[PDB]
Design a protein around this nucleic acid. Structure first.
Ligand SMILES: [K+]
Ligand SMILES: [Mg+2]
Ligand SMILES: [Mg+2]
Length: 135
RNA sequence: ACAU
DNA sequence: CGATGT
């Protein structure tokens, strides 16, 4: 119904899918960029969406913030809920970096607690998520 | 179908 | 048009 403006919004950007993957988190209210991941040479959209949420959880926990996180990714929200990224991406030498980050993100979820609500950004009603890359 |  | 996902 209503946007929760006191929140963190995250999104992935890519060049190809699979392809180069980056992600960022922004203050939903102001669009201030709060974190940005250095581009990862090969990954999928959904792996990047997943990493962005987990990074947001870690960012907010470190700062003792109870803000929710918005993502537009039905897939990544479910993977975080399950603590399991069910990616189809081949595990080989060229995908080793993204898979290391995904494995490490799952490991973090399995060793830490959080109450952060992870909310679906309703693109159809509200337009593009504030963390979008514009492409 | 829906979400990217 | 193609790909990633539930
Ligand atoms: K974009
Ligand atoms: Mg997105
Ligand atoms: Mg986007």
């Amino acid at each position: 119904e209503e946007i929760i403006w006191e929140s963190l919004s995250v999104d992935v950007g890519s060049q190809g899918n699979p392809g180069i993957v980056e992600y960022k988190g922004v203050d939903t209210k102001t669009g201030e960029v709060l974190f940005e991941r250095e581009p990862i040479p090969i990954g999928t959209n959904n792996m990047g969406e997943f990493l962005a949420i987990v990074h947001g959880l870690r960012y907010l926990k470190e700062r003792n913030s109870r803000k929710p996180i918005y993502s537009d990714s039905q897939t990544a929200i479910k993977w975080v809920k399950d603590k399991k990224a069910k990616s189809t991406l081949v595990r080989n030498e060229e995908t080793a970096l993204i898979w290391k980050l995904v494995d490490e993100a799952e490991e973090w979820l399995n060793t830490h607690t959080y109450e952060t609500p992870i909310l679906k950004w309703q693109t159809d009603k509200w337009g593009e998520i504030k963390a979008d890359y514009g492409r």
